[PDB]
Short mmCIF file of C-alpha atoms (C1' of nucleotides) in Angstrom, two decimals:
data_model
loop_
_atom_site.label_atom_id
_atom_site.label_comp_id
_atom_site.label_asym_id
_atom_site.label_seq_id
_atom_site.Cartn_x
_atom_site.Cartn_y
_atom_site.Cartn_z
CA UNK A 1 49.22 6.87 -89.28
CA UNK A 2 45.85 5.48 -87.15
CA UNK A 3 46.09 3.82 -83.43
CA UNK A 4 44.68 0.44 -85.02
CA UNK A 5 47.75 0.45 -87.41
CA UNK A 6 50.26 1.26 -84.54
CA UNK A 7 48.83 -0.94 -82.07
CA UNK A 8 48.87 -3.72 -84.64
CA UNK A 9 52.75 -3.47 -85.29
CA UNK A 10 53.22 -2.95 -81.71
CA UNK A 11 51.24 -5.99 -80.58
CA UNK A 12 53.38 -7.97 -83.08
CA UNK A 13 56.64 -6.53 -81.79
CA UNK A 14 55.43 -7.63 -78.30
CA UNK A 15 55.05 -11.26 -79.70
CA UNK A 16 58.17 -11.48 -80.69
CA UNK A 17 59.90 -10.17 -77.63
CA UNK A 18 58.24 -12.57 -75.85
CA UNK A 19 59.95 -15.59 -77.35
CA UNK A 20 57.14 -18.09 -77.08
CA UNK A 21 57.07 -18.60 -81.11
CA UNK A 22 59.28 -21.09 -82.77
CA UNK A 23 60.95 -19.92 -86.39
CA UNK A 24 58.45 -21.40 -88.68
CA UNK A 25 55.99 -19.52 -87.13
CA UNK A 26 57.83 -16.39 -86.74
CA UNK A 27 58.33 -16.09 -90.36
CA UNK A 28 54.55 -16.83 -91.52
CA UNK A 29 53.80 -14.04 -88.94
CA UNK A 30 56.39 -11.76 -90.26
CA UNK A 31 54.84 -12.55 -93.82
CA UNK A 32 51.31 -11.77 -92.72
CA UNK A 33 52.13 -8.54 -91.21
CA UNK A 34 53.87 -7.20 -94.61
CA UNK A 35 50.63 -7.31 -96.01
CA UNK A 36 49.31 -4.72 -93.46
CA UNK A 37 51.77 -2.39 -95.19
CA UNK A 38 50.36 -2.66 -98.64
CA UNK A 39 49.82 0.80 -100.05
CA UNK A 40 51.00 2.77 -96.85
CA UNK A 41 54.70 1.45 -97.08
CA UNK A 42 55.92 4.93 -97.26
CA UNK A 43 53.87 5.77 -93.92
CA UNK A 44 54.98 3.07 -92.26
CA UNK A 45 58.52 2.59 -93.12
CA UNK A 46 59.15 6.16 -91.92
CA UNK A 47 57.34 6.36 -88.97
CA UNK A 48 59.75 6.93 -86.25
CA UNK A 49 58.77 3.82 -84.12
CA UNK A 50 57.02 1.39 -86.41
CA UNK A 51 60.09 1.72 -88.76
CA UNK A 52 62.07 -0.62 -86.38
CA UNK A 53 59.25 -3.53 -86.10
CA UNK A 54 59.28 -3.25 -90.02
CA UNK A 55 62.75 -4.05 -90.17
CA UNK A 56 62.21 -6.91 -88.03
CA UNK A 57 59.21 -8.21 -90.12
CA UNK A 58 61.56 -7.89 -93.12
CA UNK A 59 64.60 -10.05 -91.73
CA UNK A 60 62.18 -12.61 -90.47
CA UNK A 61 59.76 -13.44 -93.34
CA UNK A 62 60.18 -15.61 -96.49
CA UNK A 63 61.48 -14.67 -99.83
CA UNK A 64 58.18 -14.71 -101.27
CA UNK A 65 56.64 -12.26 -99.26
CA UNK A 66 60.25 -9.78 -98.96
CA UNK A 67 60.02 -9.76 -102.81
CA UNK A 68 56.16 -8.82 -102.69
CA UNK A 69 57.15 -5.94 -100.11
CA UNK A 70 59.87 -4.66 -102.51
CA UNK A 71 57.52 -5.18 -105.57
CA UNK A 72 55.01 -2.91 -103.87
CA UNK A 73 56.95 -0.37 -102.14
CA UNK A 74 59.31 0.30 -105.39
CA UNK A 75 57.47 3.25 -106.67
CA UNK A 76 58.30 4.92 -103.25
CA UNK A 77 61.44 3.19 -102.31
CA UNK A 78 63.83 6.32 -103.35
CA UNK A 79 61.62 8.45 -100.82
CA UNK A 80 61.97 5.56 -98.24
CA UNK A 81 65.70 5.19 -98.53
CA UNK A 82 66.20 9.15 -98.08
CA UNK A 83 64.53 9.17 -94.48
CA UNK A 84 66.55 8.95 -91.76
CA UNK A 85 64.27 5.85 -90.28
CA UNK A 86 63.23 4.89 -93.81
CA UNK A 87 66.79 4.05 -94.61
CA UNK A 88 67.19 1.26 -92.38
CA UNK A 89 63.79 -0.10 -93.51
CA UNK A 90 65.13 -0.13 -97.13
CA UNK A 91 68.62 -1.82 -95.86
CA UNK A 92 66.84 -4.21 -93.75
CA UNK A 93 64.97 -5.44 -97.05
CA UNK A 94 68.65 -5.46 -99.01
CA UNK A 95 70.02 -7.53 -95.86
CA UNK A 96 67.34 -9.99 -96.16
CA UNK A 97 67.87 -10.59 -100.03
CA UNK A 98 71.33 -11.05 -99.18
CA UNK A 99 70.43 -13.98 -96.63
CA UNK A 100 69.32 -16.08 -99.87
CA UNK A 101 72.23 -15.47 -102.25
CA UNK A 102 73.83 -18.66 -101.40
CA UNK A 103 70.65 -20.39 -102.40
CA UNK A 104 70.98 -21.13 -106.15
CA UNK A 105 67.05 -21.29 -106.55
CA UNK A 106 66.43 -17.81 -105.43
CA UNK A 107 68.44 -16.16 -108.29
CA UNK A 108 65.32 -14.75 -110.52
CA UNK A 109 63.23 -13.97 -107.95
CA UNK A 110 66.01 -11.80 -106.42
CA UNK A 111 66.96 -10.33 -109.75
CA UNK A 112 63.43 -9.27 -110.39
CA UNK A 113 63.47 -7.52 -107.03
CA UNK A 114 66.90 -5.81 -107.57
CA UNK A 115 65.34 -4.60 -110.86
CA UNK A 116 62.42 -2.95 -109.77
CA UNK A 117 64.79 -1.09 -107.26
CA UNK A 118 67.20 -0.09 -109.74
CA UNK A 119 64.57 1.10 -112.27
CA UNK A 120 63.02 3.66 -109.81
CA UNK A 121 66.46 4.62 -108.65
CA UNK A 122 68.12 5.26 -112.15
CA UNK A 123 65.07 7.11 -113.49
CA UNK A 124 66.09 10.14 -110.72
CA UNK A 125 69.41 9.18 -109.04
CA UNK A 126 71.12 12.36 -108.01
CA UNK A 127 69.27 13.54 -105.13
CA UNK A 128 69.45 10.26 -103.58
CA UNK A 129 73.27 9.79 -104.22
CA UNK A 130 73.95 12.77 -102.23
CA UNK A 131 71.63 12.40 -99.38
CA UNK A 132 73.04 11.19 -96.16
CA UNK A 133 70.74 8.32 -95.80
CA UNK A 134 70.09 7.46 -99.31
CA UNK A 135 73.93 6.98 -100.07
CA UNK A 136 74.04 4.04 -97.63
CA UNK A 137 71.36 2.31 -99.32
CA UNK A 138 73.02 2.81 -102.62
CA UNK A 139 76.31 1.66 -101.15
CA UNK A 140 74.75 -1.43 -100.03
CA UNK A 141 72.27 -2.17 -103.00
CA UNK A 142 75.53 -1.96 -105.07
CA UNK A 143 77.50 -4.56 -103.08
CA UNK A 144 74.44 -6.67 -103.28
CA UNK A 145 74.06 -6.72 -106.96
CA UNK A 146 77.96 -7.72 -107.02
CA UNK A 147 77.03 -10.48 -104.51
CA UNK A 148 79.60 -13.01 -104.11
CA UNK A 149 81.09 -15.05 -107.11
CA UNK A 150 78.40 -17.96 -106.85
CA UNK A 151 75.55 -15.80 -107.32
CA UNK A 152 76.18 -12.51 -108.50
CA UNK A 153 74.14 -10.05 -110.85
CA UNK A 154 76.71 -8.19 -113.23
CA UNK A 155 74.16 -6.83 -115.44
CA UNK A 156 72.34 -5.17 -112.67
CA UNK A 157 75.58 -3.69 -111.16
CA UNK A 158 76.19 -2.44 -114.45
CA UNK A 159 72.79 -1.23 -115.14
CA UNK A 160 72.45 0.34 -111.92
CA UNK A 161 75.73 2.17 -111.99
CA UNK A 162 75.44 3.33 -115.65
CA UNK A 163 72.38 5.21 -114.33
CA UNK A 164 74.33 6.85 -111.32
CA UNK A 165 77.14 8.13 -113.97
CA UNK A 166 74.65 9.40 -116.73
CA UNK A 167 74.33 12.78 -115.96
CA UNK A 168 75.54 15.72 -117.24
CA UNK A 169 79.57 16.87 -117.04
CA UNK A 170 78.44 19.79 -115.01
CA UNK A 171 76.28 17.71 -112.82
CA UNK A 172 79.21 15.13 -112.21
CA UNK A 173 81.39 17.85 -111.47
CA UNK A 174 79.21 18.59 -108.28
CA UNK A 175 78.95 14.73 -107.66
CA UNK A 176 82.61 14.94 -107.33
CA UNK A 177 82.98 17.24 -104.32
CA UNK A 178 79.88 16.13 -102.27
CA UNK A 179 80.62 13.75 -99.65
CA UNK A 180 78.03 11.28 -99.91
CA UNK A 181 77.79 11.16 -103.79
CA UNK A 182 81.52 10.62 -103.61
CA UNK A 183 81.18 7.81 -100.94
CA UNK A 184 78.92 6.07 -103.28
CA UNK A 185 81.50 6.35 -106.23
CA UNK A 186 84.12 5.08 -104.02
CA UNK A 187 82.13 1.67 -103.16
CA UNK A 188 81.16 1.24 -107.07
CA UNK A 189 84.84 1.64 -107.91
CA UNK A 190 86.14 -1.20 -105.62
CA UNK A 191 83.30 -3.45 -106.51
CA UNK A 192 84.77 -3.14 -110.03
CA UNK A 193 88.36 -3.88 -108.99
CA UNK A 194 89.90 -5.98 -111.77
CA UNK A 195 87.07 -5.61 -114.17
CA UNK A 196 89.43 -3.48 -116.52
CA UNK A 197 86.55 -3.31 -119.43
CA UNK A 198 84.30 -1.62 -116.95
CA UNK A 199 86.96 0.44 -115.25
CA UNK A 200 87.86 2.05 -118.52
CA UNK A 201 84.43 2.99 -119.12
CA UNK A 202 83.48 4.52 -115.74
CA UNK A 203 86.50 6.41 -114.46
CA UNK A 204 86.45 8.65 -117.66
CA UNK A 205 83.04 9.57 -116.93
CA UNK A 206 83.60 10.43 -113.18
CA UNK A 207 86.79 12.57 -114.01
CA UNK A 208 84.90 14.39 -117.01
CA UNK A 209 87.36 13.41 -119.89
CA UNK A 210 85.35 12.69 -123.00
CA UNK A 211 92.46 5.60 -126.22
CA UNK A 212 91.86 7.16 -122.94
CA UNK A 213 93.28 10.66 -122.97
CA UNK A 214 92.97 13.59 -120.09
CA UNK A 215 93.07 17.05 -121.95
CA UNK A 216 94.81 20.03 -120.60
CA UNK A 217 91.89 22.05 -119.25
CA UNK A 218 90.18 18.82 -117.70
CA UNK A 219 93.57 18.03 -116.15
CA UNK A 220 93.43 21.60 -114.45
CA UNK A 221 89.93 21.01 -113.28
CA UNK A 222 90.82 17.56 -111.72
CA UNK A 223 93.82 19.01 -110.19
CA UNK A 224 92.23 22.22 -108.80
CA UNK A 225 89.64 19.97 -106.92
CA UNK A 226 92.21 17.62 -105.50
CA UNK A 227 92.62 19.56 -102.39
CA UNK A 228 88.78 19.08 -101.63
CA UNK A 229 88.07 16.38 -98.72
CA UNK A 230 85.29 14.52 -100.78
CA UNK A 231 87.22 14.50 -104.30
CA UNK A 232 90.41 13.52 -102.60
CA UNK A 233 88.66 10.48 -101.12
CA UNK A 234 87.28 9.66 -104.44
CA UNK A 235 90.75 10.00 -106.24
CA UNK A 236 92.33 7.86 -103.80
CA UNK A 237 90.19 4.83 -104.75
CA UNK A 238 90.40 5.74 -108.44
CA UNK A 239 94.16 5.17 -108.10
CA UNK A 240 94.00 1.64 -106.28
CA UNK A 241 91.49 0.13 -108.88
CA UNK A 242 92.97 2.44 -112.34
CA UNK A 243 94.31 -0.34 -114.86
CA UNK A 244 97.88 0.56 -115.87
CA UNK A 245 97.32 2.56 -119.08
CA UNK A 246 94.95 4.89 -117.27
CA UNK A 247 97.00 4.89 -114.33
CA UNK A 248 100.02 6.19 -116.20
CA UNK A 249 97.92 9.15 -118.13
CA UNK A 250 96.79 10.10 -114.57
CA UNK A 251 100.58 10.27 -113.50
CA UNK A 252 101.51 12.48 -116.28
CA UNK A 253 98.60 14.80 -116.95
CA UNK A 254 97.24 15.48 -113.46
CA UNK A 255 100.12 14.80 -110.64
CA UNK A 256 103.60 15.09 -112.43
CA UNK A 257 104.93 18.46 -111.41
CA UNK A 258 102.79 19.02 -108.58
CA UNK A 259 103.65 16.07 -106.09
CA UNK A 260 105.11 18.10 -103.35
CA UNK A 261 102.54 21.04 -103.24
CA UNK A 262 99.86 18.25 -103.20
CA UNK A 263 101.94 16.34 -100.58
CA UNK A 264 101.60 19.21 -97.81
CA UNK A 265 97.85 19.52 -98.28
CA UNK A 266 95.86 18.16 -95.62
CA UNK A 267 93.61 16.48 -97.88
CA UNK A 268 95.67 15.76 -101.13
CA UNK A 269 98.68 14.10 -99.31
CA UNK A 270 96.56 10.91 -99.13
CA UNK A 271 96.01 10.94 -102.60
CA UNK A 272 99.67 11.05 -103.17
CA UNK A 273 100.12 8.66 -100.81
CA UNK A 274 97.82 6.49 -103.21
CA UNK A 275 99.51 7.50 -106.31
CA UNK A 276 102.95 6.39 -104.73
CA UNK A 277 101.96 2.99 -103.58
CA UNK A 278 100.56 2.34 -107.18
CA UNK A 279 103.15 3.56 -109.10
CA UNK A 280 104.41 1.02 -112.24
CA UNK A 281 107.81 1.64 -113.77
CA UNK A 282 110.96 2.92 -113.29
CA UNK A 283 110.70 6.12 -114.71
CA UNK A 284 107.85 6.59 -112.67
CA UNK A 285 109.72 5.92 -109.58
CA UNK A 286 112.49 8.46 -110.72
CA UNK A 287 109.95 11.38 -111.28
CA UNK A 288 108.65 10.74 -107.90
CA UNK A 289 111.98 10.84 -106.31
CA UNK A 290 113.24 14.13 -107.80
CA UNK A 291 110.26 15.94 -106.63
CA UNK A 292 110.03 14.57 -103.24
CA UNK A 293 113.20 13.25 -101.93
CA UNK A 294 114.63 16.73 -101.73
CA UNK A 295 111.66 17.55 -99.51
CA UNK A 296 111.65 14.58 -97.00
CA UNK A 297 112.50 16.99 -94.02
CA UNK A 298 109.61 19.29 -95.02
CA UNK A 299 107.08 16.14 -95.03
CA UNK A 300 108.13 14.69 -91.55
CA UNK A 301 108.23 18.27 -90.33
CA UNK A 302 104.52 19.33 -91.38
CA UNK A 303 103.02 15.90 -90.18
CA UNK A 304 102.99 14.32 -93.66
CA UNK A 305 105.10 10.96 -92.63
CA UNK A 306 103.03 8.83 -94.53
CA UNK A 307 104.07 10.03 -97.90
CA UNK A 308 107.80 8.99 -96.73
CA UNK A 309 106.36 5.82 -95.73
CA UNK A 310 105.06 5.04 -99.03
CA UNK A 311 108.05 6.13 -101.08
CA UNK A 312 109.94 3.66 -98.83
CA UNK A 313 107.29 1.16 -99.46
CA UNK A 314 107.33 1.44 -103.35
CA UNK A 315 110.93 1.75 -103.49
CA UNK A 316 111.30 -1.91 -102.16
CA UNK A 317 108.59 -2.89 -104.43
CA UNK A 318 109.77 -1.52 -107.67
CA UNK A 319 113.62 -2.29 -106.14
CA UNK A 320 114.55 1.22 -107.46
CA UNK A 321 116.22 4.00 -105.30
CA UNK A 322 116.65 1.85 -102.25
CA UNK A 323 119.80 3.63 -101.12
CA UNK A 324 118.64 7.00 -102.07
CA UNK A 325 115.62 6.52 -100.18
CA UNK A 326 117.33 5.46 -97.14
CA UNK A 327 119.94 8.09 -97.22
CA UNK A 328 117.36 10.78 -97.91
CA UNK A 329 115.67 9.88 -94.52
CA UNK A 330 118.64 9.80 -92.33
CA UNK A 331 119.71 13.38 -93.78
CA UNK A 332 116.33 14.56 -93.19
CA UNK A 333 116.23 13.59 -89.46
CA UNK A 334 119.82 14.13 -89.02
CA UNK A 335 121.47 17.15 -89.98
CA UNK A 336 125.04 16.97 -88.27
CA UNK A 337 126.98 14.23 -88.82
CA UNK A 338 127.45 13.72 -85.11
CA UNK A 339 123.83 13.03 -84.59
CA UNK A 340 123.15 9.98 -87.17
CA UNK A 341 123.21 7.59 -84.38
CA UNK A 342 119.97 8.74 -82.93
CA UNK A 343 118.17 8.05 -86.28
CA UNK A 344 116.34 5.59 -84.29
CA UNK A 345 114.86 7.29 -81.05
CA UNK A 346 114.10 10.56 -83.47
CA UNK A 347 112.11 8.17 -85.81
CA UNK A 348 110.17 6.12 -82.81
CA UNK A 349 108.95 9.63 -81.14
CA UNK A 350 108.67 11.45 -84.77
CA UNK A 351 106.13 13.94 -83.49
CA UNK A 352 107.84 14.81 -80.09
CA UNK A 353 111.03 15.32 -81.98
CA UNK A 354 109.95 17.59 -84.48
CA UNK A 355 108.07 19.42 -81.83
CA UNK A 356 110.55 20.12 -79.07
CA UNK A 357 111.85 23.15 -78.19
CA UNK A 358 115.72 22.79 -78.52
CA UNK A 359 116.29 19.79 -80.95
CA UNK A 360 120.08 19.60 -80.35
CA UNK A 361 119.48 18.39 -77.14
CA UNK A 362 116.35 16.07 -77.55
CA UNK A 363 117.39 12.73 -76.76
CA UNK A 364 113.76 10.57 -75.87
CA UNK A 365 110.44 11.21 -74.57
CA UNK A 366 110.31 9.29 -71.39
CA UNK A 367 106.81 6.89 -70.73
CA UNK A 368 105.18 8.39 -74.01
CA UNK A 369 103.55 6.52 -76.67
CA UNK A 370 105.80 5.58 -79.52
CA UNK A 371 104.45 7.25 -82.98
CA UNK A 372 102.46 5.08 -85.27
CA UNK A 373 103.49 6.18 -88.68
CA UNK A 374 107.49 6.97 -87.50
CA UNK A 375 107.39 2.99 -86.42
CA UNK A 376 105.57 2.04 -89.85
CA UNK A 377 108.36 3.96 -91.65
CA UNK A 378 111.00 1.85 -89.88
CA UNK A 379 109.30 -1.43 -90.11
CA UNK A 380 109.62 -0.30 -94.28
CA UNK A 381 113.42 0.46 -93.43
CA UNK A 382 114.14 -2.88 -92.07
CA UNK A 383 112.63 -4.88 -95.18
CA UNK A 384 115.39 -3.18 -97.06
CA UNK A 385 118.55 -5.52 -97.24
CA UNK A 386 121.32 -4.82 -94.66
CA UNK A 387 123.46 -3.15 -97.45
CA UNK A 388 121.01 -0.19 -97.45
CA UNK A 389 120.34 0.47 -93.72
CA UNK A 390 123.77 0.34 -91.82
CA UNK A 391 122.73 3.65 -89.96
CA UNK A 392 119.43 2.04 -89.03
CA UNK A 393 120.71 -0.96 -87.56
CA UNK A 394 123.79 0.50 -85.85
CA UNK A 395 121.37 3.13 -84.38
CA UNK A 396 119.00 0.53 -83.33
CA UNK A 397 121.50 -1.94 -81.51
CA UNK A 398 123.49 0.93 -79.93
CA UNK A 399 120.75 1.97 -77.73
CA UNK A 400 121.09 1.50 -74.23
CA UNK A 401 119.28 -1.16 -72.45
CA UNK A 402 116.54 0.87 -70.71
CA UNK A 403 115.59 2.49 -74.00
CA UNK A 404 115.21 -0.93 -76.04
CA UNK A 405 112.94 -2.41 -73.11
CA UNK A 406 110.82 0.74 -73.58
CA UNK A 407 110.51 0.32 -77.18
CA UNK A 408 109.71 -3.48 -76.69
CA UNK A 409 106.96 -2.65 -73.90
CA UNK A 410 105.43 0.15 -76.97
CA UNK A 411 102.92 -1.77 -79.16
CA UNK A 412 104.25 0.26 -82.03
CA UNK A 413 107.89 -0.11 -80.92
CA UNK A 414 108.02 -3.81 -80.37
CA UNK A 415 106.75 -3.94 -84.21
CA UNK A 416 109.98 -2.31 -84.86
CA UNK A 417 112.05 -4.61 -83.03
CA UNK A 418 110.20 -7.39 -84.67
CA UNK A 419 111.11 -6.18 -88.13
CA UNK A 420 114.39 -6.14 -87.19
CA UNK A 421 114.62 -9.53 -85.98
CA UNK A 422 113.32 -10.51 -89.33
CA UNK A 423 115.56 -8.54 -91.43
CA UNK A 424 119.00 -9.76 -92.63
CA UNK A 425 121.04 -8.04 -90.14
CA UNK A 426 123.85 -10.29 -88.98
CA UNK A 427 122.73 -13.06 -85.93
CA UNK A 428 125.36 -11.09 -83.77
CA UNK A 429 123.68 -7.48 -84.15
CA UNK A 430 120.28 -9.38 -83.51
CA UNK A 431 121.86 -11.26 -80.53
CA UNK A 432 123.34 -8.01 -79.01
CA UNK A 433 119.91 -6.41 -79.13
CA UNK A 434 118.11 -9.26 -77.27
CA UNK A 435 120.73 -9.61 -74.69
CA UNK A 436 119.98 -5.89 -73.32
CA UNK A 437 116.22 -7.30 -73.12
CA UNK A 438 117.54 -9.51 -70.29
CA UNK A 439 115.59 -9.25 -67.03
CA UNK A 440 112.30 -8.07 -68.80
CA UNK A 441 110.97 -10.77 -70.96
CA UNK A 442 108.91 -11.36 -67.52
CA UNK A 443 107.05 -8.02 -67.81
CA UNK A 444 107.11 -8.36 -71.41
CA UNK A 445 105.31 -11.39 -71.70
CA UNK A 446 102.52 -10.26 -69.38
CA UNK A 447 101.46 -7.68 -71.94
CA UNK A 448 99.53 -8.79 -75.31
CA UNK A 449 102.01 -7.26 -78.14
CA UNK A 450 105.03 -7.84 -75.62
CA UNK A 451 104.03 -11.77 -75.64
CA UNK A 452 104.67 -11.64 -79.43
CA UNK A 453 107.98 -9.89 -79.12
CA UNK A 454 109.08 -12.59 -76.52
CA UNK A 455 108.40 -15.45 -78.69
CA UNK A 456 110.23 -13.57 -81.63
CA UNK A 457 113.11 -13.08 -79.71
CA UNK A 458 113.36 -16.69 -78.19
CA UNK A 459 113.12 -18.14 -82.03
CA UNK A 460 115.99 -16.06 -83.07
CA UNK A 461 118.18 -17.16 -80.23
CA UNK A 462 121.13 -19.47 -79.31
CA UNK A 463 120.46 -22.19 -76.50
CA UNK A 464 121.97 -19.87 -73.87
CA UNK A 465 119.27 -17.10 -74.19
CA UNK A 466 116.56 -19.55 -75.12
CA UNK A 467 117.29 -21.02 -71.67
CA UNK A 468 117.60 -17.51 -69.69
CA UNK A 469 114.20 -16.22 -71.69
CA UNK A 470 112.62 -19.43 -70.38
CA UNK A 471 113.86 -19.03 -66.79
CA UNK A 472 112.36 -15.72 -66.73
CA UNK A 473 109.15 -16.70 -68.16
CA UNK A 474 109.22 -19.22 -65.42
CA UNK A 475 109.24 -16.69 -62.40
CA UNK A 476 106.02 -15.40 -63.82
CA UNK A 477 104.35 -18.53 -64.55
CA UNK A 478 101.21 -17.96 -62.55
CA UNK A 479 100.65 -14.22 -64.03
CA UNK A 480 101.31 -15.43 -67.57
CA UNK A 481 98.94 -18.07 -67.61
CA UNK A 482 96.40 -15.79 -66.42
CA UNK A 483 96.70 -13.79 -69.51
CA UNK A 484 95.01 -14.04 -72.81
CA UNK A 485 98.13 -15.05 -75.04
CA UNK A 486 100.15 -16.58 -71.60
CA UNK A 487 98.93 -19.71 -72.07
CA UNK A 488 99.93 -19.90 -75.70
CA UNK A 489 103.34 -18.58 -75.10
CA UNK A 490 103.72 -20.83 -72.02
CA UNK A 491 102.84 -23.65 -74.26
CA UNK A 492 104.72 -22.65 -77.48
CA UNK A 493 107.97 -22.16 -75.39
CA UNK A 494 107.43 -25.22 -73.34
CA UNK A 495 108.03 -23.86 -70.04
CA UNK A 496 106.29 -26.71 -67.97
CA UNK A 497 109.16 -28.84 -69.69
CA UNK A 498 111.84 -26.61 -68.85
CA UNK A 499 110.89 -26.68 -64.84
CA UNK A 500 110.46 -30.47 -64.77
CA UNK A 501 113.04 -31.98 -67.32
CA UNK A 502 115.61 -28.98 -67.88
CA UNK A 503 118.07 -31.39 -69.70
CA UNK A 504 115.37 -32.74 -71.95
CA UNK A 505 114.01 -29.33 -72.74
CA UNK A 506 117.64 -27.97 -73.44
CA UNK A 507 118.36 -31.19 -75.82
CA UNK A 508 114.94 -30.45 -77.85
CA UNK A 509 115.59 -26.89 -78.34
CA UNK A 510 119.31 -27.36 -79.27
CA UNK A 511 117.95 -29.27 -82.25
CA UNK A 512 116.73 -26.39 -84.02
CA UNK A 513 119.81 -24.75 -85.78
"C1'" G B 1 95.12 -5.44 -87.14
"C1'" G B 2 99.12 -7.10 -81.15
"C1'" A B 3 100.24 -0.18 -82.35
"C1'" A B 4 96.95 1.52 -86.94
"C1'" U B 5 98.38 7.86 -91.19
"C1'" U B 6 97.31 13.94 -90.77
"C1'" G B 7 91.62 15.06 -94.03
"C1'" A B 8 84.50 12.58 -93.97
"C1'" C B 9 79.00 9.89 -93.09
"C1'" G B 10 72.74 8.04 -90.12
"C1'" G B 11 66.81 6.85 -86.61
#
RNA sequence: GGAAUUGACGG
């Protein structure tokens, strides 16, 4: 593009840099500048420098000009959207329209803008769907059509999304494994959540199976693509949004009898987590348990802890196999009867235990970060009722004081202790653990996660231990007040009241039985 | 997310 044009858009940018221009003037200048793009929208939106100015113009103009720009650039909009600079010009146009959604008077004008864009996309969509830049434009455009519940454009969402899915089954087979087309479909799927009528139209298109039934050869192909990084991400979202009838058919024809081999794949195991999390009924819980529970030790040992966390969670939600689940986990981590007192530390440091040299002497991992998914599993465990988790409660409450304080100071382990304080273990078991934290509520309050742990302990205590925690928080009132959660904790526990009028503080705390 | 799975994305 010529210097007259570059200088012009540079000069407009400098005029906005120098914030000597009000808001009503800004939007008129933005509008007047957009006109200077008529007939060279592709050239200007894709220039590595001027594109940034054009963004500023689009996010600052008035609706009637924004729509003029969209209307005039529509025949070149896919080319803009697939350009590494134009794609942000295209998204700036969409973000701009999005700012008028909550204005009810703009509907028909926006809708026409969206229509001109969707028509040129739907006429030739596959390259844009697989393009790294164009896929972002599509993902944003899909969200814009869905909008918010006040103003949305449902017919546009459907019109657009149908264009994207109306290719050959062989084309669709390669949409499934392309990262960027996969991301596009993932967005569309979530936007159609709870739209059972439309979900039942599109999921079979994406899976290439044309009641809803998967044929035996289609299942094989689906199954065989499951280890792919892009398809696996797509099927995760399919399982999240799939209506019941469709979930059941995918459970039986695709996943039944391949659960364990899928669970050990570095990509597919996440499909399996999604499948577990969205199981529907008793029979399904059974089938999953038979194929997977005998292999719990495999799953933790091969770095696939999330499968076990999912089995634990759906066990609660379906109220099935709770005891079998808990017991299966102990046996996986503690083989000899003697070592079942170590269930807690071995899960707190899941990766350090399964990876140490000599397992029969591993006790702890001093000063190390505790294991995120291990601790998530324990949080899971402590939502079961006390009937099912007696080894877990005994193990936690039997840890020596310095291990328990290490756990509370760990921002994953503290969530374990808190899940335990919220469980239905006996108050005396809870009290025994809290007492071993004595002498450390001071340092614990000072960190941000620990501040939560101090209050949740306090809430579970008798007066004797409320008064002890309170005196500990008092020795550190200065440092604690100068932290982020500190002032809340000092106020929520009424620490100033405790130092000034100890008798009155005690009497107001005891009045909470 | 107060820690946030073991496998993806931009001038």
